Design a protein around this ligand. Structure first.
Ligand SMILES: Cc1cc2nc3c(=O)[nH]c(=O)nc-3n(C[C@H](O)[C@H](O)[C@H](O)COP(=O)(O)OP(=O)(O)OC[C@H]3O[C@@H](n4cnc5c(N)ncnc54)[C@H](O)[C@@H]3O)c2cc1C
Ligand SMILES: Cc1cc2nc3c(=O)[nH]c(=O)nc-3n(C[C@H](O)[C@H](O)[C@H](O)COP(=O)(O)OP(=O)(O)OC[C@H]3O[C@@H](n4cnc5c(N)ncnc54)[C@H](O)[C@@H]3O)c2cc1C
Lengths: 457, 457
């Protein structure tokens, strides 16, 4: 690099720089998806909005490929690059909560767990994903859903404004009253339009929630899934009920006989009065014979911390995901036969139901696509051994292929590293080309292209 | 203030200053103990170690009373002052966790829930308190105990070094090899010796833990508490079992007749193989009939997020606590009789058992006193109404007074605002006077006096 520019950048940067020669480089460059092994020229750990301005201008002037990293959970591996700069936000994880306002301001590098901790100090909360180690940054920019979404919508449905650094180094506010074209785009358009350094959210009061997790044999697979899809079609918003097909974990609540064998793990909660929730959950817990039933009344922060129970975190991941408008009987049996071939104990075939509040938002209100498709399926292969990559990748691909016509769209936040060309299909032509128009205005050179990328014009 | 001193301060300060005229003054100055209503001259929200150096030097030159704020959980209200400066660390909450080193470097404003999130990304953990909103900063400086402590010790038993800003504005490292007198003092000596801007910890791998919570009627109060005190005397380190006497929360797992009436809430976990945990917990669950039994195998981060059942944040608190060397039958009847008079649904009479790894550290190895007393009781009055302060406070004082002589020492982190004169008894003469000698060296002017204070010399 040009020393003057490198020196210039350094003069303006108060964070920590990690070079390939430094000691925390190999670990700083690893992301959650360990199949992605890349070596940046530079890792810039920003500590403030001025730091990110300096890093973005440096990358622009040097012509370095820009990776932005929040929590490192990209299933496509977008948060690390070969030979470019990582704009790493993981040290910007402060959150200010006003109890009086029911508002949270969170930095771009926050983890969900920290966010939930800070808001639950006041018994407040807003929708986010179910794994607490996930970064707020990439989750919100792609939409973000979890236990609270059927009641309160997507994370973007509770976003009130952002502070964002654009590719030319300027700091902008985006809200419904300031740069509203940009505010439209960041609500579902990913990292395409700049580095969000602050997210502001509306918060809701969420007290203890009745929660249940249990396991069904695949022998009862057809009636469980059918009961689930039938019930969710008319369920109240307060009910969330998700199915995860997987090998049974060797946990004491399940008989040793079931351990390591394909099962349906069913998790459900009631967002509302726990007494009503006890009644609602028990009415849906017995479509199959429930094994290893755990029922609890949990602080919301404890529900957020629950997924998923297990001795390790898988090192290698490959996901194939899409939406469904209906889950047909043919589609049910296909999921069940593919679940029966699960090989790794970390792999999950996820069946999620959204709808509710998410569905109620007008389709063009944000850049998030496919609100009106209630089902999400995610074949989430996960494993350890690098020499078994092909078998696990193959399980997720062929499951996806067997379902293909039932599936439409795609959640940008579940895309794998080979799915760069799924961007148009995911958004649809209308949203895609409106996003292209916002990109030509705020990122005309496509400085931000490590994402489900939207080329300008 | 003197405008050239202030102008120098603000020039060196990259954080936020909050003045009494500022919007968010009133909220920034509130702490968790809402009986403490104080108005600082200035709240300085630090964002880095250089910020803390600037604020500390500004306070010293200005002669402002210094309050240090981490998580705001001071039961004595030490984290806000009338007329001084709050050096507020709550925006410094970044955590670096290295999976290879099993190390966590945590800034001095971290909350436990953020720390546990960050370490559990690698299935790692280290002992801390049981409520995730507590500040790491004040908790560790007093010792720190929770679910992992009988197995792995106090938080200070896993602290390997700190970065600390002393009253003269210098930044020091303290460890077993650098400034070891100071390193002894900060491990149990509170905020007396400076502002800790970073804590480094050893981490341990902690996977799923078998957990149980249940409630006993006070009718069976005597046999439950006797079984508890008899069993813990010889329990393995892996078992933690705590009792919380309280009004039963109106939760669906409990019969409506028990709602709002005094009960023993018993929580236990096994830090180890969940199948062995299931065996161990069931052997201790049946000294009385368990009502509202919840059993679960939880990620450790979810165990940390669990406390407490009901999840309501009380506005007003008053605590009386001490250690016990033995729990006699007469002390047991006293605890049961006072619990029967609990008036507020947020109030708890806590019965904890430490021992284990805490008790195997030599007594003089740190400044934390009374490792050899295994029992802790905490009469924690908590309520909403400011016009009823006297009743709630009276319940706590009277309970403590009833216990009398069974109680010795006292955990500095459970002191109330009227307990400044308990510092000597809490530490004991030998530790107190050694701490004074460390105080004479590192804080001779007693600039840091909002704490269980140790005067120099
Ligand atoms: C185990 C696991 C569980 C999950 N659970 C769910 C869930 O329940 N619900 C759900 O909706 N999703 C979930 N996700 C997906 C998650 O939403 C996406 O992986 C998301 O992009 C991760 O965000 P991140 O900041 O952690 O990842 P990163 O790898 O850091 O970044 C992902 C993308 O966001 C961009 N980006 C990140 N931060 C910023 C920022 N501040 N400004 C601009 N761009 C940014 C990056 O450039 C990249 O394109 C899960 C993922 C994993 C791995
Ligand atoms: C609801 C609740 C549950 C609790 N649970 C437990 C538990 O399970 N186990 C346990 O051991 N304790 C527990 N505690 C007590 C806790 O350890 C003390 O309240 C502790 O002082 C909290 O630290 P803090 O930073 O949050 O509070 P603060 O009010 O911000 O600070 C308390 C003291 O520490 C000083 N201080 C704080 N941070 C720093 C720093 N970085 N450098 C120098 N000084 C600092 C302050 O000056 C003050 O004297 C609990 C408290 C509450 C209120």
């Amino acid at each position: 690099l040009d020393p003057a520019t490198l020196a210039a950048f350094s003069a303006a940067f108060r964070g920590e720089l990690i070079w390939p020669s430094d000691a925390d480089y190999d670990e700083a460059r690893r992301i959650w998806n360990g199949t992605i092994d890349r070596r940046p020229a530079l890792i810039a750990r920003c500590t403030s909005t001025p730091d990110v301005v300096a890093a973005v201008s440096f990358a622009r002037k040097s012509g370095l490929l820009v990776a932005v990293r929040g929590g490192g959970h990209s299933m496509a591996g977008h948060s690390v690059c070969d030979g470019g700069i990582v704009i790493d936000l993981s040290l910007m994880n402060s959150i200010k909560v006003s109890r009086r306002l029911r508002r949270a301001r969170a930095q771009g590098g926050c983890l969900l767990g920290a966010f939930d901790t800070a808001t639950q100090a006041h018994m407040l909360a807003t929708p986010a994903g179910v794994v607490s180690t996930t970064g707020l940054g990439g989750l919100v920019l792609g939409g973000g859903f979890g236990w609270l979404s059927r009641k309160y919508g997507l994370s973007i449905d509770n976003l009130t404004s952002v502070e964002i650094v654009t590719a030319d180094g300027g700091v902008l506010t985006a809200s419904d009253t300031e740069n509203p074209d940009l505010f439209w785009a960041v609500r579902g358009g990913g990292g395409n339009f700049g580095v969000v350094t602050a997210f502001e959210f509306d918060l809701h009061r969420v007290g203890p929630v009745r929660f249940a997790s249990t396991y069904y044999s695949l022998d009862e697979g057809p009636q469980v899934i059918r009961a689930w899809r039938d019930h969710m079609a008319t369920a109240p918003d307060e009910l969330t009920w998700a199915l995860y097909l997987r090998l049974a974990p060797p946990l004491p609540e399940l008989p040793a006989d079931m351990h390591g064998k394909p099962v349906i793990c069913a998790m459900s909660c009631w967002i509302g009065d726990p007494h009503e929730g006890e009644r609602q959950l028990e009415s849906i817990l017995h479509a199959g014979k429930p094994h290893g039933l755990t029922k609890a009344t949990l602080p919301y922060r404890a529900l957020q911390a629950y997924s998923f129970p297990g001795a390790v975190v898988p090192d290698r991941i490959y996901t194939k995901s899409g939406y469904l408008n209906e889950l047909s009987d043919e589609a049910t049996d296909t999921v069940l036969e593919h679940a029966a071939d699960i090989a790794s104990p970390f792999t999950q075939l996820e069946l999620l139901y959204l709808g509710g509040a998410v569905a109620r938002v007008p389709d063009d209100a944000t850049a998030y696509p496919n609100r009106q498709s209630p089902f999400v399926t995610n074949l989430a292969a996960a494993w350890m051994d690098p020499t078994e990559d092909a078998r696990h990748t193959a399980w997720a691909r062929e499951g996806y292929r067997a379902l293909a016509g039932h599936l439409s769209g795609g959640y940008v936040n579940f895309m794998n590293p080979g799915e760069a060309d799924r961007t148009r299909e995911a958004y649809g032509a209308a949203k895609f080309e409106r996003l292209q128009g916002v990109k030509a205005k705020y990122d005309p050179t496509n400085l931000f292209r490590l994402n489900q990328n939207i080329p300008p014009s």
